[PDB]
Amino acid sequence: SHTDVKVPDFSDYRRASEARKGFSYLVTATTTVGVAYAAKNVVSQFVSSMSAGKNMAFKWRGKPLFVRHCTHLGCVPIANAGDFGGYYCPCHGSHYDASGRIRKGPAPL
Amino acid sequence: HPLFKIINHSFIDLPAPSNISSWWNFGSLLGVCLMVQIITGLFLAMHYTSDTMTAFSSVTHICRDVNYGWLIRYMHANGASMFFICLFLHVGRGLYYGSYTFMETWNIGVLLLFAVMATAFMGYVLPWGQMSFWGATVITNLLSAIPYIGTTLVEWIWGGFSVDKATLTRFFAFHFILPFIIAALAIVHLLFLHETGSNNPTGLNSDADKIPFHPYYTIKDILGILIMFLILMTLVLFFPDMLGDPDNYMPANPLNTPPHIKPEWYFLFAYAILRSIPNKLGGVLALILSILILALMPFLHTSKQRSLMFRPITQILYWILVANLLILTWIGGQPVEHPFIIIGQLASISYFSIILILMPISGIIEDKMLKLY
Amino acid sequence: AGMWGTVGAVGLVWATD
Amino acid sequence: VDPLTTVREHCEQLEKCVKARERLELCDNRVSSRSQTEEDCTEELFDFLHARDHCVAHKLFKNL
Amino acid sequence: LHPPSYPWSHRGLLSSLDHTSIRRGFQVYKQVCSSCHSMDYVAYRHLVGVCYTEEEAKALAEEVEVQDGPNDDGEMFMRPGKLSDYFPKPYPNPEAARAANNGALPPDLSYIVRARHGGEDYVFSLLTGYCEPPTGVSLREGLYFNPYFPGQAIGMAPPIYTEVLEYDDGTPATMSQVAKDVATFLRWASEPEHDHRKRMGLKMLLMMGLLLPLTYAMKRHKWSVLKSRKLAYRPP
Amino acid sequence: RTSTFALTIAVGALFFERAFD
Amino acid sequence: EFGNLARIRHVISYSLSPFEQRAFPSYFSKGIPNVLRRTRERILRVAPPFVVVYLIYTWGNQEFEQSKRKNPAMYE
Ligand code: HEC
Ligand code: HEM
Ligand code: HEM
Numbered sequence: 093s094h095t096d097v098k099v100p101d102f103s104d105y106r107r108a109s110e111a112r113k114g115f116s117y118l119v120t121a122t123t124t125v126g127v128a129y130a131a132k133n134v135v136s137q138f139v140s141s142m143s144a145g146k147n148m149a150f151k152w153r154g155k156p157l158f159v160r161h162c163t164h165l166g167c168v169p170i171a172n173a174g175d176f177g178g179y180y181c182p183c184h185g186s187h188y189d190a191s192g193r194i195r196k197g198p199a200p201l
Numbered sequence: 202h203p204l205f206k207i208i209n210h211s212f213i214d215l216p217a218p219s220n221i222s223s224w225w226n227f228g229s230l231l232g233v234c235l236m237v238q239i240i241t242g243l244f245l246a247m248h249y250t251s252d253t254m255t256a257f258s259s260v261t262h263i264c265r266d267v268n269y270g271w272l273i274r275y276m277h278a279n280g281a282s283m284f285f286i287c288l289f290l291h292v293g294r295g296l297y298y299g300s301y302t303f304m305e306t307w308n309i310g311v312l313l314l315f316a317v318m319a320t321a322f323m324g325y326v327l328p329w330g331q332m333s334f335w336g337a338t339v340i341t342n343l344l345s346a347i348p349y350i351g352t353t354l355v356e357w358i359w360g361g362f363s364v365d366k367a368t369l370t371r372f373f374a375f376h377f378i379l380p381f382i383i384a385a386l387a388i389v390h391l392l393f394l395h396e397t398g399s400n401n402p403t404g405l406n407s408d409a410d411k412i413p414f415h416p417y418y419t420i421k422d423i424l425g426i427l428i429m430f431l432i433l434m435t436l437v438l439f440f441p442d443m444l445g446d447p448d449n450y451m452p453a454n455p456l457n458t459p460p461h462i463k464p465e466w467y468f469l470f471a472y473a474i475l476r477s478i479p480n481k482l483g484g485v486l487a488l489i490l491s492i493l494i495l496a497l498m499p500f501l502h503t504s505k506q507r508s509l510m511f512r513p514i515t516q517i518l519y520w521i522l523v524a525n526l527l528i529l530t531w532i533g534g535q536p537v538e539h540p541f542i543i544i545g546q547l548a549s550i551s552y553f554s555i556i557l558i559l560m561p562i563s564g565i566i567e568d569k570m571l572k573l574y
Numbered sequence: 575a576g577m578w579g580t581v582g583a584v585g586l587v588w589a590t591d
Numbered sequence: 592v593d594p595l596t597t598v599r600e601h602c603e604q605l606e607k608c609v610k611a612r613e614r615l616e617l618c619d620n621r622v623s624s625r626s627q628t629e630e631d632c633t634e635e636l637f638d639f640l641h642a643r644d645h646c647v648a649h650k651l652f653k654n655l
Numbered sequence: 656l657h658p659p660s661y662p663w664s665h666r667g668l669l670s671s672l673d674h675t676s677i678r679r680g681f682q683v684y685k686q687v688c689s690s691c692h693s694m695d696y697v698a699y700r701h702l703v704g705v706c707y708t709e710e711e712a713k714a715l716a717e718e719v720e721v722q723d724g725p726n727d728d729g730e731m732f733m734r735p736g737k738l739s740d741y742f743p744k745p746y747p748n749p750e751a752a753r754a755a756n757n758g759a760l761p762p763d764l765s766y767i768v769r770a771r772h773g774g775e776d777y778v779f780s781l782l783t784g785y786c787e788p789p790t791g792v793s794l795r796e797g798l799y800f801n802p803y804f805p806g807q808a809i810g811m812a813p814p815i816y817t818e819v820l821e822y823d824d825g826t827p828a829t830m831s832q833v834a835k836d837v838a839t840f841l842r843w844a845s846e847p848e849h850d851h852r853k854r855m856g857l858k859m860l861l862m863m864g865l866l867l868p869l870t871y872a873m874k875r876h877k878w879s880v881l882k883s884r885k886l887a888y889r890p891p
Numbered sequence: 892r893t894s895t896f897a898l899t900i901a902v903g904a905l906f907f908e909r910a911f912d
Numbered sequence: 913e914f915g916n917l918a919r920i921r922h923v924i925s926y927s928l929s930p931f932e933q934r935a936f937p938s939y940f941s942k943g944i945p946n947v948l949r950r951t952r953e954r955i956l957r958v959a960p961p962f963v964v965v966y967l968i969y970t971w972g973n974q975e976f977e978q979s980k981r982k983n984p985a986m987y988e
């Protein structure tokens with residue numbers, strides 16, 4: 093009935109309270125730490141895979157090496173053209189002086 | 202929430218049997234692997250080209266220069282091997298515990314296998330080594346066996362008179378798609394199963410004892426994922442070439458061939474079967490049946506008990522089947538000479554006779570012993 | 575929840591390095 | 592002096608290699624024993640070779 | 656013939672390649688094997704290792720002028736090389752090699768060890784296993800009997816003899832010492848990451864030894880509840 | 892505390908990375 | 913879903929708190945003896961086939977070996 097059967101003895105499984113809980117949490121904490129440690133390693137290297145009056149240029153180091161006698165969006169300034177006798181970038185109208193200084197337009201530096 | 206309802210319906214509040222053993226982990230492992238194979242395949246595809254001109258090279262570059270390439274490439278190869286290990290154990294679980302009575306799940310299943318097999322050939326042929334080249338020609342020629350339209354089909358696939366760049370580039374796409382393809386077919390798998398729920402090792406109706414999946418079979422799947430990752434990383438970081446054939450590192454000799462040519466282990470037996478049948482066509486057919494015999498399996502169940510937990514004679518026949526499957530895997534490796542051939546011929550005869558004849562007769566006998574028949 | 579923002583930030587710095 | 596030669600010699604001295612060599616010697620002698628025969632001895636040669644070689648590796652690399 | 660076992664040091668599970676030897680084997684390749692073989696996929700940058708740092712590699716990088724540089728038309732060989740310069744090739748065209756190799760082909764040896772079943776052993780054996788042809792031996796063209804060689808008609812000319820070359824380190828250049836040393840280098844090049852990896856594998860074993868019992872303990876926590884569940888049937 | 896549990900764990904993973912690396 | 917699954921009646925199901933039960937019951941100590949029992953029970957039906965196999969492999973290898981083995985007498 094309601095009271096005929098008392099709860100069976102689980103002592104066999106029973107452990108000797110917050111301390112027990114803390115230990116178990118500590119375990120989860122360490123494991124999470126382990127997962128995270130691996131994460132930084134894996135993700136980093138994971139991402140790491142994708143990691144590696146006239147002008148003249150010789151494409152030094154894969155970029156135009158202007159040598160003469162765009163800060164804006166990266167086009168090639170056209171030498172011997174423009175309103176400042178230096179350069180002009182047909183992309184957005186940046187005029188560079190012979191010194192290569194941006195004088196007019198939207199080129200930042 | 203209509204997106205969280207499906208996720209809850211399939212992974213959190215799904216009623217699962219409380220007594221399913223570790224085997225039942227393996228299918229989830231397969232899903233994790235597919236993910237791994239695919240993601241690895243992406244990076245493998247990155248920094249890679251389908252050009253016989255640069256395919257073998259950039260890959261060597263992956264092995265040599267690509268940032269952590271050696272790691273992603275050998276993770277991809279040994280993850281394909283781990284995929285086939287988990288696939289074989291998943292199919293063996295389905296055969297042993299009578300899970301083939303879920304017929305739609307099994308058929309999505311049997312198809313899934315053929316597909317995975319192909320992705321292997323795909324991934325295999327792609328590095329353009331000596332072994333890849335001579336392996337591709339071999340199986341592509343398998344198709345030529347077709348009675349009337351064979352020649353055309355072979356030439357179609359090859360895209361020319363003989364496998365050459367035309368093949369490499371197209372095989373590349375299938376090997377980029379079949380993975381996506383199989384992935385979806387698996388999704389079908391999960392649906393056709395939740396309609397019926399998973400089976401238990403006793404083979405009985407487990408409706409009286411079902412538990413949630415989130416706290417009970419999730420941490421179990423996480424532990425199985427951790428163990429599978431341990432085996433995969435000790436396969437990659439310690440013995441990266443115990444399962445491959447060194448021939449791979451040989452740029453394909455369009456002209457020369459490997460004195461010893463062997464299909465990879467996962468299919469070794471498959472070809473073992475072919476080697477056995479004298480007739481070319483016969484071999485191709487038997488080969489196909491080898492995989493297809495499984496699909497045929499739900500119509501051969503003649504027992505009143507679903508699982509083999511309480512069926513000892515069919516347990517003995519099952520372990521004899523696993524035994525001569527291992528024998529066929531060994532024979533494929535052995536060269537063509539006595540007595541490897543005879544074993545191959547018998548082993549194939551015993552394989553087809555155990556699956557086709559011996560197990561239903563044994564199930565009838567077992568039903569007779571329990572005063573049921 | 576307040577500390578979660580903080581927790582994430584801490585781990586973020588670590589991971590991002 | 593190549594330690595390889597020395598070690599090879601030493602291993603040969605090993606009674607095991609000595610007996611393996613005995614086989615080879617008997618067999619190479621057999622090579623010359625008959626003409627119309629096909630006593631190539633490659634098999635016995637290889638037999639001794641591997642046996643001795645095992646011994647060699649067993650005690651060569653360290654010298655190396 | 657099945658090549659027997661060999662106690663390669665680097666092969667040790669957690670141990671790594673001995674660069675000193677590797678270095679010595681790169682010398683051996685540079686002075687002997689490069690006349691018919693070339694580490695194409697290997698570059699002086701790839702060559703970098705304790706055996707040869709980029710600096711030393713640079714010396715070697717500058718040590719060559721063959722096909723390192725092209726001319727007005729990029730033909731023949733026209734200029735020396737630098738760090739990025741890839742390893743020089745004994746032949747600018749396959750035919751060249753074929754021509755200067757009995758018509759046969761001296762394979763570049765970049766991945767040679769990986770290519771050969773039991774390569775490291777094979778290599779050592781082939782280079783030092785010509786042995787003796789007891790009978791029925793008809794070497795046709797520039798061949799060399801070698802039971803270790805599949806056909807005993809290697810045609811890989813035996814290029815190493817006692818003091819075949821002279822090791823800069825001074826370690827006696829015995830055929831075997833030479834063979835073993837170059838072997839190391841060849842192995843090193845075939846897997847420029849052998850050492851890199853084994854360190855990962857050690858970290859992986861330590862992390863799995865930490866993480867497997869802890870995840871097992873969690874699982875057994877959350878599964879203890881059921882594993883202690885006591886069922887009782889109490890028909891009224 | 893749950894939140895601190897995660898917090899200390901994140902920090903634990905943070906330092907462990909450096910130490911293990 | 914949970915609920916509406918099976919008409920199970922009168923099946924009291926006692927249980928104990930996870931943090932209350934010993935955290936990690938000895939597996940080697942208690943479980944493996946039974947595991948041994950479990951494995952020994954089935955192995956008696958599992959290894960027999962493999963017992964046969966190993967034999968096949970062994971015999972085959974040596975047999976094939978002898979097959980290759982040439983007899984000096986052959987063509988002598
Ligand atoms: C002066 C000539 C010459 C030198 C020096 C030489 N080789 Fe070769 N090697 C050849 C030729 C010619 C072939 C082509 C043989 C063939 O294709 O049948 C060859 C082929 C090979 C092969 C292919 C055999 C196989 O298993 O497929 C290997 C391996 C090889 N050599 C290793 C070496 C090693 C190792 C060294 C030195 C440490 C070396 N060779 C030095 C001429 C040379
Ligand atoms: C859509 C996802 C995938 C992509 C993009 C992909 C891409 C590639 C690429 C580029 C390669 C060549 C690089 C290499 O040599 O390793 C390759 C090789 C391979 N892939 Fe895949 N793959 C994918 C999924 C799979 C799957 C699911 C399998 C398993 C069935 C698989 C099995 C292989 C195998 C066996 C190789 C040969 C590895 C070797 O060289 O030894 N791949 N994959
Ligand atoms: C693409 C490869 C496959 C994947 C990714 C896959 C994945 C899964 C997953 C995640 C489950 C649910 C978990 C489980 O039941 O243990 C499952 C169940 C199942 N799969 Fe597969 N599976 C694949 C191939 C196969 C094949 C080839 C077969 C047939 C031999 C098969 C037969 C089954 C069966 C019978 C079940 C239900 C078993 C049960 O719960 O009692 N699967 N599969």
